[model samples]
Target: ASVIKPEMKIKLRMEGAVNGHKFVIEGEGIGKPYEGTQTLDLTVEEGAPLPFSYDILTPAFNRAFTKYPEDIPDYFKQAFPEGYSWERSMTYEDQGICIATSDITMEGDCFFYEIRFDGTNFPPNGPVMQKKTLKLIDATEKMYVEDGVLKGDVEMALLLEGGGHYRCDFKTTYKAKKDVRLPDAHEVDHRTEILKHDKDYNKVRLYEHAEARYS
Candidate 1:
């Protein structure tokens, strides 16, 4: 019904060629059950979900919403502003990649994707620049070029098009991009006043939680 608590941090990540790509999502309350990387294909649908309307942002896409969630609805809408639908219709430059949803399932405490990638635009590079479908499952990733630098833990998947889902954690930063989700300097000071926020969990602590859920 709403975003995660302030105590819970999130990460979304993406990796691949200009044409082919994959996403991975990780966070405190979301994909906490995953310690390693995962993968998905394009021909995915009909797995499960009703007249489906839901999403889990990859470490790459998570930052885009934390600022003003009300502005966008689901991950689809965030990734494809011109495509996804909520209460009404939104439009964007079909750019190059398109998405359709179906057969989504829940993992641990979050949901998995069954999104279809439609690249009718097929640029010279990116997603094979062809009409195809791909799935971004229980994994994670976005951009902003203004304001100050924002930093947090984000999952990174370095190989999707190279047929690899290798990943790692990164302390990331974003600048200028308006409507970001993380707390600014002033807010961070306030957070220190109320919460017991300390630091990113070490690999042992992080992976242990994932093992409890995934194993």
Candidate 2:
């Protein structure tokens, strides 16, 4: 018998203000057998200049600024003259098994976000399982109103398994939508497998993995 994995669609919409500057971040993606794709779009309304710096914009919007200059918005071009980046059409393929996870928390003046996909590439002719973790977003931001502008500090760290780390510190600005919800309980299991940790974070698993053998 052969293993048949389940496909999953993940979507997230967050809206809110930093100081008073309104902003929204929306992310969506699909996970399929041996492959996965995701895209994250951000919108910050006009107000006092955003406190974002080049490093803060690199991970998410760099490709958009380099490969798709024409699609880059005037505001971003002007703000980060040299370049920008975003997770546009990112793909993960050629894996034997893939699992997606998401952890989100929004309350008062704090926002916590973490999402990632773990891929296991088993030996084509053996039983060993090689692992890779792709972290789309792992950040914590604290927002407060000051001088009539949304002001906050952010601490973010991301991993791309085979690829090196992409980490940065910056100031940032979200609202929550009724239709946008967290992943179900069973979708993610942080307490089991390789992810077992003592941290108090909770994550929603978005895919199912199974194993089968042939005679």
Candidate 3:
């Protein structure tokens, strides 16, 4: 009867980096069966500026201009005619109840758990899938329970898509709570939102560049 409770209070502090972009997120939540409410403070340190000419940053641009120039959107061609450069830095305060699910295995004092929010949850606004899929990072919790609290660490080394590497270490703790509530069907559609924003930004950038270039 020592399995993780159906309801609990989860306190998490995660510090990690992706391709040199470091970030830290701390949050607490009331975890219900298959769902939870998380209020998180996310801080991301700026990484080196990436030139849009960089192969990694211009995959879409390259595919369109090089292989399908005629099919390329005029806006993309106009927006990045000479490329752009940008860095990553952000701070976010988010509070919401979303999908949270887990798989747990325990033996005596030791336990292992795989927790997920949405599918393949890592890096906010990351790709989405209908089901869990193998990923570059195995963000699993390996821990032991003491004083009715579970504590653990996670270590991961992942290769970047174009080039470079990403590594991270996370510390986590969980305690059982008597009062927790579940949400209806409220899931953040990060993938679709990202896609929409990508298109919008392309047009916005095109307008900005056109204004500067032709005006």
Candidate 4:
């Protein structure tokens, strides 16, 4: 069951300390992306509830995020005990500043949009980052994912630490899907066991899209 608000908006301010630096970020946007359609065929176990959401924050520099049932909240353990469905809505920041953010949602079998990044921060080896503040001045995106792929328009703007600005305006939708399974409890830390035994599990590629842009 999803909340269907015809004209709704969300605002949230997040603050945290990352890499030993403390910073704050904010997000304000219109239109909720998860509405407009109903599409799912898996028979959720009897008495299974809805509003199943998965959220996470990724690491810095360059690293990959792998998934397992443990990655999700335990309340959902029984939903897909054998393995569950997948969705991702994330942001990336260095030293806790709002470098970039992504809001990808799963509505039925489709994923919908709003994805942007900070281009000014492109060159990472600058001491300007040591300053106490940073913000995104221009950023906007609109799109959706269908058949496990994201296609749409995106824009980015951010101030680089040194004395330059980075920006981009483009449109693209690549072939990527999130039809993966969460690892069973017995297979939590046993990567070898999963690869050698449970061949049905599908691993997710959460940051590959952002990687393609910032790489």
Candidate 5:
């Protein structure tokens, strides 16, 4: 459920890093764009959870992330046998972070946000990734499988607190290394798999809107 705070304000320092491009947020959401000037300092978590959330989520993801009887942690344990539980122990840097948008109404506000972490350093692969074939994975699954429960939400409350009527969005590209250090067919296979992997992010363009009604 969406939290409703009357005069509540959020502070967060956002740094969007994709491919080689970088964008930062340190704006004042006052009269035009939003209310208030800025919020907090900066935060960096090595491998934190960056979940993506949107009002009119993509149809594919809407059904995919729905909370099902099968999603229960204990049930997942039995379903996979060997072990393929969708819920895993997530690691947060410390005190993590919390960010919120301005506000929203009943008819429904359409905007999107995500929580991301550094893929370059994680578990067993962290060390192994330094030398040979280098590849960084983004996210694994989509959100909002059910209707309004279980689906992961975005941090910074990250709403469309900008100077837009209903919706708008921009784009970015991600680049990878082109060279493989030594000669290892096995390593090549891993790189091949990594290159083919692109689930952690949704770059889809959605053009949707519903007008407000007044009584």
Candidate 6:
């Protein structure tokens, strides 16, 4: 049993708002401003021996690659690109890892989440999933924090055992204030939304490799 206790956390600046109002005539006598933040503390668990955990970082990296292209390193891009040779005795054994990210968009309070995906490793077969003996790892939420930011998070990783099962699952944070006698509602709805939506695939040649498995 190669049990490894890995600890990690991430902070993302999403969006925020404040709704401080008093029983005033205008219904706008208090200081109301909002901000956004996301944090997480995770513990990986429910790990298996093989064919359970896969590398979902591809998707995660895909998202990050679009928003934060500079955040990703070049070597990671080279070794795990669209057509990289993965047959030369390819393997990765992560000792442990920790990661955090944040952005600029002054909004409100903050939200924190955490996850724990068990340790995993992959055997050599080739570059694609269909040609390799892979292992998958999954985990659930460990802790969470919320004030204006959203709450709840889950972390997971798939190993080829080095790379496979390329996907990630986690909840994001959002905040809103009561509707007053404002001029626009739809305008405000779009303004107070929280979700790290990134749709850049080419920037980070990331894709789920489920089809690589034959069985």
Tell me the tens digit of each residue's lDDT in model 1 across 47-99.
21111111111222222223332333222212222222111011112343233
lDDT of 3 by residue, 1-215 (tens): 21333343333333333333343333333323122111211121232231111111111111001111222212211322222121111111111112223333333322223333211123344221111112233233244444434343444333345443444443334333321121111111100011111221221111000010110
Per-model lDDT: 0.25, 0.28, 0.25, 0.27, 0.20, 0.21
Candidate 5: misplaced stretches above 4 Å? Answer: 1-4, 28-149, 152-215
Model 6, 1-215: lDDT tens per residue? 00100111222211111011111000000111111111222112212112211232211211111111222222111211121111001123332222222221111221121111222232223322232323234333222234522233444434444555533344433221221121111101111111221232111111111110001
Error (Å) of candidate 4 at residue 5 is 3.7
TM-score of each: 0.22, 0.22, 0.24, 0.25, 0.19, 0.22
Candidate 2 structure quality by residue, lDDT tens digits, 1-215: 01212333334443433222343444433433222222222333232233221122223311101111222222211322122121111122322332323343333222233433222342333211121334435333344444333233444443445665544344322122222221111111111111221121112222222211111
List clash counts for every candidate, in order: 38, 16, 0, 1, 17, 34
Candidate 4, residues 1-215, lDDT tens digits: the string is: 12323333333333333333333333333332222111111121222221111011121101011121234322111222122222322222333123433333433322333333232321244322333113233333344445444434444434445645444344443332233322221211101011111111112111111111110
Error of 4 at 118 (Å): 15
Q: After TM-score superposition, what is the CA distance of residue 173 in candidate 1 from its true location, in Å?
A: 16
Could you tell me the TM-score of candidate 6?
0.22
- Between the candidate structures 4 and 6, which one is better when assessed by TM-score? 4
Where is model 3 more than 4 Å wrong at Cα?
1-136, 179-215
Name the regions of candidate 4 deviating beyond 4 angstroms: 1-3, 6-17, 20-128, 132-134, 142-146, 149-155, 160-163, 167-215
- Across 1-215, the per-residue lDDT of candidate 5 in tens digits comes to 12211222223233443222233332111110111111112222221222322121121110111122321221111211121112112221222221222111111122112222112122232222212222221112222223212223221111223322222121111111121111111100000011121232222222111111111
Model 1 gets an lDDT of: 0.25
Scored against the true structure, residue 167 in model 4 reaches a CA lDDT of 46
User: Relative to the unseen true structure, what is the C-alpha lDDT of residue 152 in candidate 1, on a scale of 0 to 100?
Assistant: 32
